[model samples]
Target: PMFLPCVLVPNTRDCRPLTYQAAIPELRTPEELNPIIVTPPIQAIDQPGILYSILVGTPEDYPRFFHMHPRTAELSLLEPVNRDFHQKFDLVIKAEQDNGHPLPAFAGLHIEILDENNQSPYFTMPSYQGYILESAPVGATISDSLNLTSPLRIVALDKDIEDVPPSGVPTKDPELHLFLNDYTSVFTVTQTGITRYLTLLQPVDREEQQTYTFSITAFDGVQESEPVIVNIQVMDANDNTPTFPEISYDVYVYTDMRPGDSVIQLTAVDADEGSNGEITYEILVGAQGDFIINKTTGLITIAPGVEMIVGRTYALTVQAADNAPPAERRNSICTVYIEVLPP
Candidate 1:
């Protein structure tokens, strides 16, 4: 026996009647007529989706009703499982996307790099060594670089202090401050931005065993560099007076000695060097007689026709001088008592 087929309708009101032809096969049970087959959906090469649907009725029973569209299968294969998968596959499916492309795994990570503070400022010379005459003026300027016209700053360092304070501070004690004078100029920061200039104003005496130490500091607007310790040795200027061993001299000359006789040899010594020590002697007369002194040798001699009488004493003023310019001299009177025998 033949059976009639049933058609599915959207709502009851729009039900469509099924037409049965002659010699139709009779259905025993609805389950035996239409069997449902379950199968897993086909997955896309780059995505996931359902590919084919189950067919229920035979072609003879159903007169070629609803059919699967050609484009529908392709659409179903293109659809993604979720938004993320859709975006990923869409990026891959686009024609502009490069072939054999893979999704970027790791992309955006920020890195922070830091700079080093190792740059340092140094002096052209470790220590400045110089010599000038004793009487350099208070404002005398000493500079290393040609462009620097200002006076150099003289900063003294106290060895007694465990650490030097930063630049631009007053000294601790008034006596210690005497090591530096007001005439000393203040150092200016260098154009290179790291170093400073230092100078001395007062003359130093090495003979007095005086030494000066200084701490030089270079400061940025905010920070200061390490302090540099400098030693300034003062050299001496020989500006001392010379004195004789004895202030006065007494001697005896024989009156019996004939004229043109050598009376005595007088000598003086000086401890200075060069022309400062060179001495020349001259005789000054009180009673004006014939007496002469050797200029180079410092020798006293009786002039011709001069006679020494017994018990007579001759007092002669002598001037001794150095050969240096503006000639320094000392004067002393010598007394000589003479004894002469009857001729």
Candidate 2:
């Protein structure tokens, strides 16, 4: 008796049907053929049924993008692959024989996808979110990258492209143009190739504006990328000095007032913040008769064995300052006089 069995092989064109033939003229093997005679380049292209799409690792948005044939050990695109830097497929093939004590054999195929530039430029990062100090000087690096010698770089990505070849062969790569929608008064950008440097055109005042926000657009010669939001924060600087309202502070050193006491509070005001505005009191000149000045608050206290006599007068040139940074501090001075009446 004789028998025949048919199976299908998938390709770009269609699933072609295959009928098995026996090796011997008169042998009754239950299993007719083991799949070992297939060729390595068992692939077809330009077929109506074949589809290809961009191969993402198990596509969620486009799930039906890839196709695989388990029996044929083949992988192909379910739809047209648009843009992917890495477009390679690896497949392993096995050769299994009939029951005559044969071990399995293996082969491998590594196929590279010839990618097409079907995409324009877009930012990998949606926008920039950060800040810079206001006290930065002219040509001072804004993001630590700004300088007259070297400008900062704002790079943009071109679609379907893997990387720029180090060969320095100038291919017509996408050119990047960066400019600020706002902050043009304070910020500017210069472009070279795909790198655009964010330049600070002028100084910024945190007191005038503590923080600033602006939009920057990266433009390819033909297409403009989405607006990248930029946030610039200004750090504080110690630019203001503490001030005293009264030119001369007057208070009576009464005989009744005891030692280690402030008759009236003395404080200076600063227009800055943190240590810049912190007020410290000091008697630079004209302080006599053992009076203690407050280190933090502008209060005058009497020391041990300090006395106020009847009809006696005392004067103080008191200074008040804020906790300042390393370089310099701001302070103000005023004259304080105390008179004692007869006790």
lDDT of 2 by residue, 215-300 (tens): 78766556666787777666777887888889887787667777887755776778776777777787886656568777777777
lDDT of 1 by residue, 1-343 (tens): 0111223467653223322111101212233323211121111122122222212333222212122222121111211122211111101111111234432111111111111223232233355533332334444444433334444443433322212345445343211111122223422122321123344445443444334556554432333445555544433333433344555556566667776677767776654456656777777663247578888887778777877776566666766666656744433344433334454
How do all models score by TM-score? Answer: 0.36, 0.56
RMSD of each: 30.9, 18.1
List the pairs of residues colliding in candidate 1: 1-25, 1-26, 2-24, 2-25, 2-26, 3-25, 153-185, 157-214
Once superposed on the true structure, which residue ranges of model 2 sit more than 4 Å away at CA? 1-120, 129-132, 144-152, 160-173
lDDT of 2 at 197: 55
Top of the candidates by TM-score: 2
lDDT of each: 0.39, 0.57
Model 1 TM-score, all chains together: 0.36
